[PDB]
């Protein structure tokens, strides 16, 4: 694991609060040890000799001592809570910051519910780090002073206490591995249940439309039964651990009283001294038993931290990248696919020996039937995925030798589905560019024909868009995406079926807009309708991951090939 | 509370378990009380008279008593754990079933992360119904016997130890409202953080493409900071509660020893009797303080249960329906919209004064631009939403007097976006009628051309599909949706732009299949391309929630209106 080393890093700045906690703990333990002698003073001196005034005076003094140690415990609890909140905040921030940067094949291969559950199985790390748990660990460490004093008082009774301690330590090891496995098994089942719940909430309209509420109930019921079986198996290990710990504690107390009474009879002690030993055992055995009782909480936190570190061990997208050529400053130039092969993991290949050469500052089209792999080409250009064979070149430089930030800032991608995040229209338009002038946003919205309906909104570029832009129409969200892409001022523009829901008036406006750009930006159009690609320089027809033919519209029509058949059938 | 009544009713079948728990706890308390007298015999008979053999015999007897007590505690804990598992099972299943049965307006106004947080906050209820918390409540209940014995032994010390109980009650009452509010605030902030994380996971492609990882880290960091502040505010209420209860406990113990020593000096008790009284306080004051120490868990579980009950108080999709007429068994008739007005919530109207009749058994096309209200019309026909004014009449009877099962069993909807759930291809194609004959799936799949590509799969119809059908292209998913809708054998078939991604050959085959039906199945085709509605019987044009042009293709062209303009522009 790396979490123990990472834990020490968090406490490095706080080298002054830890000292205060240590000193407060020392004072608290010393005051408790001092106050443990009250029963000895009662039974050896005050009760035997009937000293009422001394009874009152020493009782008040010990009450004052107890109040002092309570005030000390209040002081260190605040510092411990502050440290716990700081550590938990750092852990959560690091995990989210890392999970944002992971490669794209991580999100494809993982259900949303799994990631959500892994993130939200982190409140369990707060519980084992909160004010009371760290206080109990500190008391367990401080129990050394109590043990030393107990040895100073009696030897045989200290050895009995030591045997009790060893029996505590033996039980912990036996229940260490079984409790982790039981806590890990329930976490996976909880992740599966959360994934099922998320998936059922997603397709609730389809569930209702088909009357599939009962089947979903049965499936989630089976998952709940699995979770409850895991929890029950994990919940009976706690019963065995608690029963063994209670046996040890109670029998050790009875044995200590037995041996102390034997010593008192033999004359090696007195009743007051034995009672003081029993009272001082609260600072040698009680903290240890409290730690053993908290052990399941620590095991749950450790399992959750290990599950988080499983994600944190994955290398991010920038860590899998070869060195970047600093001479490349712009992505303007010819785009070439050189024998590109790609398959989504280990399945059948999607692209087989792909060969394009898109001239710089030219508008080209990639067309084909659904599933041919046009969006896969667009995502390879965006460098979401890497070709298994061949390479993609921009102006003679491999796309793997260009910095990822430059690639993702100089290439604009408009997808089939538009993602609208919770915020105003202004915030959605300025995504990743929250320092742009307002006039530029107006210019982009006008260029994408999005200004007209935005100015008709109640807030006029401040309208809080709900989740997934429900209040926005299907063709209104596409115009927002196109405006967001144009606001980027890119060097390569990819329109992946961005005009499917737009009307003729709007599509003509956007067509002139992307036609009116400088003769240095490359516009790549991925379209399913052939009526929107007639006036572009070159058209590549993709048929199951292969450029079977290419050329302008006139040349493709004057070939009587697959493109001519597509044009005749689709028109 | 209402939630408490449900949990108590969950205990009605399990009545013999409760009796066994009660008897075992009675025996446990009696044995503990009997064993608390060990220190009385030590310090009054065995030590005073130096009896050694009697010391060994009595110590062995009390060790046996303690072992019996531990065995009884083990048995009772097992029973309590099983009871708590059953209760939590029932709670989870009830909440999931209800949330599945909720109306479509609930899922529109709520983010997914809120529902997922509310469901998984039920893990907080599991802690309060654990095998250790219920044991502490039962011990607190049984503490009445210990209190009676303390009163019988010494009235003065019992009165002193009774004030400690009152001070616990006052401290708990004072810290009752503040603790619940902090828990609600923390849970709300956690729900917001979960919603943010879910939304970020959904749109990871856009976030990566626009370089918004840094911008998305600031929002989530702010939400994490809000959660941390809310947690620290609750973490200081617990510190105050613990400090006050510790003050009461320690000062009460010191005062009890003080007054006991005074009584022993005055001759009202003996040295052994005072120690026996203090040992017997482990069954009067210790259970109460242990219960008070669990106030955070109980309050957190109460808040979580209240949050669940907030959802459970909703009226579902079937309790809002009127008295359904049972004389309707088939939705075969003229569908009519009579002055139907509808708006999504309090926003602008979507459909205004729609008059639209659909002849029985004919094919009808509804067309227009995006945002016109076509999918809204389809969802109104499916009873997903209710019109504000006017009625929908599938036949002479209104559609709100038809059973909701019949509406969702005789009308098939093929939405624009196809939802595929994690399972086999055969499991997805049933989705509501899993008992379909295996030969009936082939007939539906061959009608939708889904059989050809399904046969070219590893496990054929048993091939496992991902959570979103990533391995299936858009055309394949649309064909699966069409096959699933046809497999239902409906009376009204709504094709909501289902053939947008389909090939010309596939579209022609599916249109041929649609042509050949029972001659009484009404087909509604919501289309964006006007070339796919040429041969349909009647066409309605939607212009911002108004039916402006109606008629066949020849009449609409002959009218030379809005539909003529759309035809000229698009084709
Ligand atoms: C499921 C359970 C069912 C069965 C359980 C069976 C349990 C077995 C129970 C056994 C009871 C033991 C009886 C002790 C009574 C002492 C009598 C005595 O003479 O005192 C002697 C102390 O004797 C010792 O030194 C220590 C002996 C006890 C071992 C400690 C066991 C720890 C707690 C056990 C927890 C068990 C938990 C087990 C967890 C698995 C005094 O000796 P001395 O000569 O005066 O000293 C000389 C001093 N001088 C040199 C200064 C002069
Ligand atoms: C602020 C938080 C502090 C928490 C502490 C709570 C404890 C409060 C309890 C105070 C009550 C103190 C009562 C002391 C009783 C006492 O100290 O006295 C006992 C009387 C028994 O005496 P009695 O049975 O009558 O014997 C004959 C003797 N005499 C009458 C002949 C003198
Ligand atoms: N996220 C994914 N994981 C696995 N396979 C995928 C994924 N996305 C697409 N595929 C498969 O790879 C092929 C690529 O097609 P796609 O990129 O969707 O092109 P188009 O835009 O023409 O649909 C599809 O046939 C699909 O089955
Ligand atoms: N879940 C929703 N919440 C609020 N408004 C919505 C929702 N769904 C649709 N609308 C609004 O209702 C109108 C009708 O849209 P819709 O009929 O779904 O589009 P289309 O006709 O292209 O299918 C749209 O203008 C949209 O703003
Ligand atoms: Mg695509
Ligand atoms: Mg629609």
Tab-separated table of N, CA and C and ligand atoms in Angstrom, chain A residues 155-157 159-165 167 171 243-260 262-263 266 268, chain B residues 52 55-56 59 63 67 70-71, ligand 1:
chain	number	residue	atom	x	y	z
A	155	UNK	N	3.778	-6.798	40.736
A	155	UNK	CA	4.378	-7.534	39.632
A	155	UNK	C	3.462	-8.636	39.109
A	156	UNK	N	2.918	-9.464	40.005
A	156	UNK	CA	2.061	-10.564	39.570
A	156	UNK	C	0.786	-10.053	38.913
A	157	UNK	N	0.164	-9.029	39.497
A	157	UNK	CA	-1.038	-8.465	38.895
A	157	UNK	C	-0.727	-7.793	37.564
A	159	UNK	N	1.581	-8.865	35.553
A	159	UNK	CA	1.757	-9.970	34.617
A	159	UNK	C	0.416	-10.544	34.183
A	160	UNK	N	-0.562	-10.573	35.089
A	160	UNK	CA	-1.911	-10.976	34.698
A	160	UNK	C	-2.482	-9.999	33.676
A	161	UNK	N	-2.288	-8.698	33.908
A	161	UNK	CA	-2.739	-7.699	32.942
A	161	UNK	C	-2.028	-7.863	31.603
A	162	UNK	N	-0.736	-8.187	31.638
A	162	UNK	CA	0.020	-8.401	30.409
A	162	UNK	C	-0.489	-9.620	29.651
A	163	UNK	N	-0.852	-10.682	30.371
A	163	UNK	CA	-1.429	-11.856	29.723
A	163	UNK	C	-2.770	-11.507	29.089
A	164	UNK	N	-3.565	-10.674	29.765
A	164	UNK	CA	-4.815	-10.202	29.171
A	164	UNK	C	-4.538	-9.416	27.894
A	165	UNK	N	-3.511	-8.563	27.920
A	165	UNK	CA	-3.140	-7.787	26.737
A	165	UNK	C	-2.737	-8.709	25.594
A	167	UNK	N	-3.627	-11.827	25.144
A	167	UNK	CA	-4.827	-12.496	24.654
A	167	UNK	C	-5.649	-11.568	23.770
A	171	UNK	N	-6.351	-12.438	19.643
A	171	UNK	CA	-7.675	-12.470	19.028
A	171	UNK	C	-7.724	-11.565	17.802
A	243	UNK	N	-17.659	-11.575	21.628
A	243	UNK	CA	-17.785	-12.576	22.681
A	243	UNK	C	-16.423	-12.991	23.219
A	244	UNK	N	-15.443	-13.204	22.337
A	244	UNK	CA	-14.108	-13.557	22.813
A	244	UNK	C	-13.484	-12.414	23.608
A	245	UNK	N	-13.641	-11.178	23.125
A	245	UNK	CA	-13.100	-10.026	23.837
A	245	UNK	C	-13.762	-9.857	25.201
A	246	UNK	N	-15.079	-10.056	25.272
A	246	UNK	CA	-15.768	-9.956	26.547
A	246	UNK	C	-15.365	-11.049	27.515
A	247	UNK	N	-15.195	-12.275	27.015
A	247	UNK	CA	-14.690	-13.356	27.857
A	247	UNK	C	-13.345	-12.967	28.449
A	248	UNK	N	-12.431	-12.495	27.598
A	248	UNK	CA	-11.100	-12.124	28.073
A	248	UNK	C	-11.195	-11.018	29.116
A	249	UNK	N	-11.975	-9.974	28.827
A	249	UNK	CA	-12.056	-8.827	29.729
A	249	UNK	C	-12.636	-9.218	31.081
A	250	UNK	N	-13.799	-9.869	31.080
A	250	UNK	CA	-14.442	-10.207	32.337
A	250	UNK	C	-13.664	-11.223	33.147
A	251	UNK	N	-13.160	-12.274	32.493
A	251	UNK	CA	-12.386	-13.262	33.225
A	251	UNK	C	-11.083	-12.673	33.738
A	252	UNK	N	-10.472	-11.748	32.994
A	252	UNK	CA	-9.284	-11.085	33.494
A	252	UNK	C	-9.575	-10.203	34.690
A	253	UNK	N	-10.715	-9.512	34.677
A	253	UNK	CA	-11.094	-8.727	35.843
A	253	UNK	C	-11.319	-9.591	37.069
A	254	UNK	N	-12.029	-10.707	36.892
A	254	UNK	CA	-12.289	-11.604	38.017
A	254	UNK	C	-10.991	-12.230	38.516
A	255	UNK	N	-10.089	-12.587	37.599
A	255	UNK	CA	-8.815	-13.182	37.989
A	255	UNK	C	-7.940	-12.160	38.704
A	256	UNK	N	-7.975	-10.903	38.260
A	256	UNK	CA	-7.202	-9.857	38.922
A	256	UNK	C	-7.721	-9.629	40.333
A	257	UNK	N	-9.044	-9.596	40.502
A	257	UNK	CA	-9.601	-9.468	41.846
A	257	UNK	C	-9.249	-10.677	42.708
A	258	UNK	N	-9.278	-11.872	42.119
A	258	UNK	CA	-8.929	-13.095	42.836
A	258	UNK	C	-7.489	-13.046	43.341
A	259	UNK	N	-6.547	-12.740	42.448
A	259	UNK	CA	-5.140	-12.687	42.831
A	259	UNK	C	-4.867	-11.540	43.795
A	260	UNK	N	-5.559	-10.412	43.628
A	260	UNK	CA	-5.392	-9.314	44.561
A	260	UNK	C	-5.891	-9.648	45.951
A	262	UNK	N	-5.973	-12.670	47.149
A	262	UNK	CA	-4.973	-13.600	47.666
A	262	UNK	C	-3.764	-12.854	48.217
A	263	UNK	N	-3.304	-11.830	47.496
A	263	UNK	CA	-2.162	-11.047	47.961
A	263	UNK	C	-2.494	-10.282	49.236
A	266	UNK	N	-2.401	-12.702	52.033
A	266	UNK	CA	-1.015	-13.039	52.334
A	266	UNK	C	-0.220	-11.861	52.882
A	268	UNK	N	0.775	-9.045	51.175
A	268	UNK	CA	1.590	-8.328	50.203
A	268	UNK	C	0.949	-7.030	49.733
B	52	UNK	N	-8.980	-18.689	52.598
B	52	UNK	CA	-8.348	-18.918	51.304
B	52	UNK	C	-9.116	-19.917	50.444
B	55	UNK	N	-12.208	-18.470	49.319
B	55	UNK	CA	-11.914	-17.488	48.281
B	55	UNK	C	-11.854	-18.147	46.909
B	56	UNK	N	-11.141	-19.272	46.806
B	56	UNK	CA	-11.041	-19.973	45.530
B	56	UNK	C	-12.400	-20.484	45.072
B	59	UNK	N	-14.577	-17.490	43.959
B	59	UNK	CA	-14.081	-16.926	42.708
B	59	UNK	C	-14.422	-17.823	41.526
B	63	UNK	N	-16.780	-16.806	38.369
B	63	UNK	CA	-16.308	-16.976	36.998
B	63	UNK	C	-17.299	-17.786	36.172
B	67	UNK	N	-19.351	-16.630	32.830
B	67	UNK	CA	-19.364	-17.388	31.581
B	67	UNK	C	-20.790	-17.656	31.110
B	70	UNK	N	-22.033	-14.528	29.543
B	70	UNK	CA	-21.481	-14.314	28.208
B	70	UNK	C	-22.184	-15.197	27.183
B	71	UNK	N	-22.477	-16.448	27.543
B	71	UNK	CA	-23.190	-17.324	26.616
B	71	UNK	C	-24.582	-16.781	26.307
C	1	LIG	C1	-14.528	-19.895	26.429
C	1	LIG	C2	-13.831	-19.741	27.778
C	1	LIG	C3	-14.132	-20.907	28.724
C	1	LIG	C4	-12.893	-21.360	29.515
C	1	LIG	C5	-11.994	-20.183	29.957
C	1	LIG	C6	-10.856	-20.649	30.888
C	1	LIG	C7	-10.090	-19.467	31.542
C	1	LIG	C8	-9.014	-19.950	32.544
C	1	LIG	C9	-9.111	-19.262	33.928
C	1	LIG	C10	-8.100	-19.408	34.813
C	1	LIG	C11	-8.171	-18.736	36.203
C	1	LIG	C12	-6.772	-18.474	36.806
C	1	LIG	C13	-6.792	-18.452	38.359
C	1	LIG	C14	-5.994	-17.258	38.938
C	1	LIG	C15	-6.157	-17.123	40.458
C	1	LIG	C16	-4.848	-16.742	41.146
C	1	LIG	C17	-4.598	-17.525	42.430
C	1	LIG	C18	-3.253	-17.128	43.070
C	1	LIG	O1	-2.708	-17.871	43.812
C	1	LIG	O2	-2.667	-15.884	42.748
C	1	LIG	C19	-1.348	-15.965	42.244
C	1	LIG	C20	-1.321	-15.232	40.886
C	1	LIG	O3	-1.259	-16.195	39.851
C	1	LIG	C21	-0.647	-15.720	38.668
C	1	LIG	O4	0.478	-15.346	38.697
C	1	LIG	C22	-1.435	-15.681	37.344
C	1	LIG	C23	-2.289	-16.935	37.116
C	1	LIG	C24	-3.506	-16.662	36.210
C	1	LIG	C25	-3.142	-16.569	34.723
C	1	LIG	C26	-3.640	-15.276	34.080
C	1	LIG	C27	-4.804	-15.510	33.113
C	1	LIG	C28	-5.241	-14.211	32.403
C	1	LIG	C29	-6.769	-14.010	32.395
C	1	LIG	C30	-7.535	-15.264	31.964
C	1	LIG	C31	-8.592	-14.963	30.895
C	1	LIG	C32	-9.002	-16.216	30.108
C	1	LIG	C33	-9.609	-15.875	28.748
C	1	LIG	C34	-9.492	-17.016	27.735
C	1	LIG	C35	-9.762	-16.537	26.296
C	1	LIG	C36	-9.799	-17.686	25.282
C	1	LIG	C37	-0.390	-15.328	43.274
C	1	LIG	O5	0.875	-15.943	43.144
C	1	LIG	P1	2.036	-15.630	44.283
C	1	LIG	O6	2.737	-16.925	44.650
C	1	LIG	O7	1.386	-15.040	45.520
C	1	LIG	O8	3.148	-14.553	43.692
C	1	LIG	C38	4.405	-14.451	44.358
C	1	LIG	C39	4.705	-12.958	44.606
C	1	LIG	N1	5.938	-12.777	45.341
C	1	LIG	C40	7.018	-13.465	44.678
C	1	LIG	C41	6.242	-11.374	45.404
C	1	LIG	C42	5.787	-13.286	46.678
